[PDB]
Symmetry: C2
Subunit: 204 residues, 2 copies
């Protein structure tokens, strides 16, 4: 009885779809045309946004709220640290990723050529700057896939549609992270057809 209303290429919906796949819970997923909930379903979410999760009598929106709900409701596998301090670090990194990087993604998608390129340049350089972080661990500042990777993975997956290509200093490091995460069963299972179309290896 758990239903997720998702944007087929919506990065926020993708985050939730990865979590749902990781948790392995039974769920009905319905893709909308674009990035909005049908006007007739406004009763489910006054803001008519996706992702919107309906699990029994509880309706939730805002991917961040949905992901924590799923992690608290379905403990295994754990996607957050168990202790308060590292949990704060994780929530903060998730927030920084969304505020610093998903904002650039938004400017690239909604901007004219000039705005898009300026956002693109900044996003590309910043992503490459954190490359050293991976020479240390398999996942983002962790040895286990977590919600932080649920934020970073959908973003890096979209590099092709953002018009970004990694080469030079740091590219090898980022690509290694991308390969590790993109190869996971849950990540592959999280993909919609429109998302699979983005890369050769998943394209049908």
């Amino acid at each position: 009885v758990m239903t997720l209303f998702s944007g087929p290429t919506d990065i926020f919906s993708h985050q939730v779809r990865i979590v749902l796949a990781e948790k392995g819970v039974s769920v009905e997923i319905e893709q909308v045309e674009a990035d909005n909930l049908p006007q007739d379903l406004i009763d489910l979410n006054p803001y008519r946004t996706v992702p919107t999760l309906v699990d029994r009598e509880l309706t939730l929106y805002e991917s961040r709220i949905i992901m924590e709900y799923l992690d608290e409701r379905f403990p295994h596998p754990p996607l957050m640290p168990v202790y308060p301090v590292a949990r704060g670090s994780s929530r903060l990194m998730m927030h920084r990723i969304e505020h610093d990087w998903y904002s650039l993604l938004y400017k690239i998608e909604q901007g004219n050529a000039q705005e898009a390129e300026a956002a693109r340049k900044q996003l590309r350089e910043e992503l490459l700057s954190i490359a050293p972080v991976f020479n240390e661990t398999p996942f983002f500042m962790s040895e286990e896939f977590s919600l932080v990777d649920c934020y970073l993975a959908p973003l890096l997956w979209r590099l092709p549609v953002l018009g970004i290509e990694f080469t030079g200093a740091g590219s090898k490091e980022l690509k290694g992270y991308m390969t590790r995460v993109f190869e996971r069963d849950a990540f592959l299972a999280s993909l919609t057809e429109a998302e699979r179309e983005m890369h050769l290896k998943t394209r049908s």
Copy 2:
């Protein structure tokens, strides 16, 4: 350095609604904390070194630096369980987080339009906010706090907003005013709320 002290440090804005939320939670938990009210023109060096965005509120507890009041408040609730400011179960917790999100999205945005918009906009925002707040009156006939039997982080979002109504030129009369005023009395009289106020915030009710 703040990150080297054995006591928490909160960098706060004297009239910042978000810092107020955090100060209420610190008082409720009764933890030792050194609170520094900052000035935009001359921020303390530790804030600059630990928070690249130079914003408030910022909590420094040992080697951990947090910003974004929501993250700080949940950190405090998880690190210091007594007294509980969040529900225990997943479903109730989800609803609580959703309400905090809606209060900030629907009401904190009107507060900003009221303070930085032109007369026409400010007045339009002032009228919308007043109406919406009075519309939740029925809630207080069901429970003493906002959709809860006990004071929680949701009230830590709503209280600072209602405390600022005087500066927003809003006053409750008519239908629902009794309910809203009863809630305000209940939260504004709490030890933690009084303890959370800065002198500047107190003057908002002169």
